[PDB]
Symmetry: C2
């Protein structure tokens, strides 16, 4: 699917942007958010928001294991303006905290 | 504090807008997201994004109880970008469905 790969590329380029949302994507694709939400879930098997979260968590994982960056820095680099919100999402995703992930 | 009240009034005026984010609040308070992130959690005990979710869910219940609005309309009116994310967030937040809350 070319349209799936287009969507993949936009997200790969954009996920580090804390202002990147379903609405920004849909606008880039000339679609309503309402239709994109349905079509995304059809094509990828999970909701846009969960896919976006997964890309950010996977990058967070990478930075935690390969750098000495602080949580507030990693949060910023994976599209989170709030370091504590980042920590709460990470803990829900990996079941432990970013600090603990380095232990 | 008057501080907590000021921040609440501002959120109250804006939570309905799906484009309302921590960075918008920062602009309105004239504080960087770096500072606001931490100061908000100190005052409210949870991150801004969680507080924002809370206001939207409470409004969701008021709407469900007092109107015959459908889920897609409610999702729109409480600041979500698409109905499926709204109904999944509602389920997680309350662990019943909007329909179940209305029964």
């Amino acid at each position: 699917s070319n349209a799936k790969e287009l969507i993949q590329n936009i997200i790969e380029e954009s996920y580090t942007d804390s202002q990147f949302t379903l609405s920004v994507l849909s606008e880039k694709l000339d679609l309503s958010s309402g239709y994109l939400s349905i079509m995304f879930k059809k094509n990828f098997g999970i909701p846009f928001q969960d896919y976006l979260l997964q890309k950010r968590m996977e990058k967070a994982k990478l930075l935690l294991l390969t750098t000495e960056l602080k949580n507030y820095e990693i949060a910023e680099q994976v599209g989170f303006e709030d370091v504590n919100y980042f920590i709460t999402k990470f803990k829900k995703y990996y079941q432990i905290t970013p600090k603990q992930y380095r232990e």
